[PDB]
Amino acid sequence: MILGIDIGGANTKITELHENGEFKVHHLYFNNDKLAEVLKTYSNDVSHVALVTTAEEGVDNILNAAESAFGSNISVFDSNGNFISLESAKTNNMKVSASNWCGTAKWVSKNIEENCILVDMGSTTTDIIPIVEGKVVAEKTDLERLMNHELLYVGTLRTPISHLGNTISFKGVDTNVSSEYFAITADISVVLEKVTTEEYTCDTPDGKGTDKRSSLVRISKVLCSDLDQISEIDAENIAKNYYELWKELILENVENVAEKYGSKKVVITGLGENILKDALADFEVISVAERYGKDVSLATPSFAVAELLKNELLEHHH
Amino acid sequence: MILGIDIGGANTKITELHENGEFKVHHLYFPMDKLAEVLKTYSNDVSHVALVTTAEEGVDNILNAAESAFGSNISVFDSNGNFISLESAKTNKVSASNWCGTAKWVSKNIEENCILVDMGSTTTDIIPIVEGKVVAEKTDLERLMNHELLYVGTLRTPISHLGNTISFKGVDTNVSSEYFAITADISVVLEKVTTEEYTCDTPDGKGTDKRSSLVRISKVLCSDLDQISEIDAENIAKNYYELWKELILENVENVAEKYGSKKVVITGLGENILKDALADFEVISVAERYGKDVSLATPSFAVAELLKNELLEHHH
Numbered sequence: 001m002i003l004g005i006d007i008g009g010a011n012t013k014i015t016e017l018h019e020n021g022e023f024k025v026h027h028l029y030f031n032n033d034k035l036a037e038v039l040k041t042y043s044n045d046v047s048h049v050a051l052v053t054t055a056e057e058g059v060d061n062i063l064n065a066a067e068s069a070f071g072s073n074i075s076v077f078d079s080n081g082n083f084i085s086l087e088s089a090k091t092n093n094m095k096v097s098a099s100n101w102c103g104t105a106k107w108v109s110k111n112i113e114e115n116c117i118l119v120d121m122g123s124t125t126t127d128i129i130p131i132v133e134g135k136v137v138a139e140k141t142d143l144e145r146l147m148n149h150e151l152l153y154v155g156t157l158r159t160p161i162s163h164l165g166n167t168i169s170f171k172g173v174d175t176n177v178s179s180e181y182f183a184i185t186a187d188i189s190v191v192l193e194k195v196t197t198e199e200y201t202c203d204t205p206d207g208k209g210t211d212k213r214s215s216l217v218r219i220s221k222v223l224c225s226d227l228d229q230i231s232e233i234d235a236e237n238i239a240k241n242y243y244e245l246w247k248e249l250i251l252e253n254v255e256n257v258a259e260k261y262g263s264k265k266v267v268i269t270g271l272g273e274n275i276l277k278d279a280l281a282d283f284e285v286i287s288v289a290e291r292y293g294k295d296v297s298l299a300t301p302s303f304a305v306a307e308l309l310k311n312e313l314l315e316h317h318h
Numbered sequence: 319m320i321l322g323i324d325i326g327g328a329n330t331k332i333t334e335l336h337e338n339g340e341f342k343v344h345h346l347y348f349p350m351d352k353l354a355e356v357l358k359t360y361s362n363d364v365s366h367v368a369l370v371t372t373a374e375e376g377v378d379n380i381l382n383a384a385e386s387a388f389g390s391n392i393s394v395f396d397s398n399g400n401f402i403s404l405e406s407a408k409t410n411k412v413s414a415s416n417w418c419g420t421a422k423w424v425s426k427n428i429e430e431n432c433i434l435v436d437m438g439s440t441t442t443d444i445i446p447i448v449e450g451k452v453v454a455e456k457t458d459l460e461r462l463m464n465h466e467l468l469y470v471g472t473l474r475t476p477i478s479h480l481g482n483t484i485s486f487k488g489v490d491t492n493v494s495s496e497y498f499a500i501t502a503d504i505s506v507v508l509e510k511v512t513t514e515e516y517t518c519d520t521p522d523g524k525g526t527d528k529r530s531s532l533v534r535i536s537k538v539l540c541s542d543l544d545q546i547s548e549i550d551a552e553n554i555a556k557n558y559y560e561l562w563k564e565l566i567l568e569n570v571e572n573v574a575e576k577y578g579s580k581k582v583v584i585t586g587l588g589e590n591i592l593k594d595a596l597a598d599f600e601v602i603s604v605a606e607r608y609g610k611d612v613s614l615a616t617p618s619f620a621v622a623e624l625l626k627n628e629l630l631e632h633h634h
């Protein structure tokens with residue numbers, strides 16, 4: 001078996017690649033060694049990728065925990081998109097860190113499409129990186145990606161509503177909105193049924209319920225109102241109009257990156273795949289959730305590196 | 319000697335209006351009365367204006383907290399624009415805008431046909447005054463729908479609220495949606511307010527100085543001072559300050575066009591930004607005519623004057 005380990009601190013994902021062809025994606029929340037070792041039975045090679053950040057390096061703990069769980073057969077994914085040894089190479093922290101899109105993009109360029117745009121929308125961000133002739137050609141830093149529209153800050157859950165726009169069409173009139181932290185995209189998604197109530201993973205702006213009504217109450221606060229001054233149907237239209245700005249913002253950013261290299265194909269994945277295929281309907285859409293299943297779509301980084309590792313192996317031999 | 323009491327929830331402003339016209343503004347803030355008495359001697363009449371709401375009725379909690387420190391010489395300001403007795407407040411209209419009291423004052427002592435523009439730490443009120451009558455909408459909702467309420471302030475406005483893209487090194491650049499920088503960072507960097515005028519907390523709970531603001535701004539573009547220069551981060555502030563002024567001006571133009579108004583009376587913490595953004599109009603600065611202390615506590619000053627003008631009027 002080949003494992004794809006994606007440790008992101010809050011939630012570490014594991015992809016098991018079996019030789020009979022099937023795979024399994026696992027989710028974990030939270031001693032790390034004893035934990036990882038339970039997934040070590042029958043493992044010959046493991047690709048390790050750190051999706052987390054400098055939050056509270058500690059990269060020494062993950063490497064040591066992974067090494068005592070899987071041995072020396074560990075390949076960590078570089079910050080450049082290359083596999084390097086657990087030994088020395090990565091044991092020297094820096095160079096280990098990786099983005100949420102690098103492995104995924106490299107995996108797409110070699111297994112799904114050589115010329116396209118990878119659009120990965122999580123809960124907070126949307127990565128939009130171009131792939132040309134089998135090569136990932138996005139900028140390296142987030143700053144350079146923001147300047148190149150390869151990084152857009154719109155997610156399915158944690159995006160403040162006014163980030164989408166400081167004015168919105170309300171009752172046929174362009175209406176100014178509050179800047180206070182009252183509602184987020186999670187509220188929009190719940191109200192428009194783009195996500196079930198069980199997917200509202202982040203804390204609510206007010207600390208109240210995640211239900212459809214509570215969301216509408218939070219939305220109402222964007223126009224300094226409440227479910228008394230306005231109806232639930234009016235607050236619902238607020239969310240629908242914002243959903244429109246949401247898709248529109250995604251499209252223009254993707255169109256812009258597409259124009260650079262004439263790419264006409266997009267490959268979508270992540271929490272916001274439903275939203276993505278709605279906003280990018282004009283392009284030829286290749287859905288990861290349709291081709292590999294929803295779980296892979298929600299844990300692409302771990303799956304991508306496991307496949308890259310397994311392909312390099314079969315390639316090394318053959 | 320008249321007292322203009324302005325209670326805004328947990329923060330209150332008290333104006334001392336002496337006979338000869340001399341005045342002294344007092345800013346009070348404390349966790350909750352007793353200190354209301356430290357200013358009761360040598361005081362006859364007093365006006366009361368509560369420019370705050372509730373947020374988890376609750377009016378008696380203070381009107382009685384004053385009646386015990388000012389007897390019944392208190393004249394509370396209505397939400398309809400007129401003064402009324404404590405009795406009418408106790409039994410009921412007592413709570414109101416941060417702008418009504420001020421507007422009324424402007425339409426009698428400053429100008430009858432204009433637009434009052436009050437930019438505080440968080441909001442900007444744009445209420446039109448026509449023929450001496452404040453003709454702005456009632457609720458906040460209606461005002462947001464009529465460019466009479468703009469949610470941008472001198473201090474606590476999340477930067478991306480001004481625009482989710484910004485011009486950087488000549489390119490349309492996307493920005494982070496995370497709470498990293500607020501308008502207070504812009505004001506301090508462009509010296510539109512003093513370092514000591516940075517009231518609200520800082521996003522990263524750090525210094526309110528120049529550099530500390532540039533550090534937070536850099537984060538709006540997923541960067542820091544090791545990746546971009548201080549001049550660069552400052553250009554980010556300037557460009558955002560532009561979108562800021564543009565946003566204010568557009569809202570003021572929509573209202574001006576509706577009422578043919580040509581004059582603007584600006585007041586509030588962000589007066590320096592207001593007179594800059596509204597340079598095209600005929601600008602009447604409250605801070606330049608009455609001093610900064612008045613532009614920072616206009617509500618309490620207005621009711622102080624209004625009451626006086628009515629007392630010297632009930633004598634006819």
Ligand SMILES: [Ca+2]
Nearest residue numbers: 138139140144
């Ligand atoms: Ca480059």
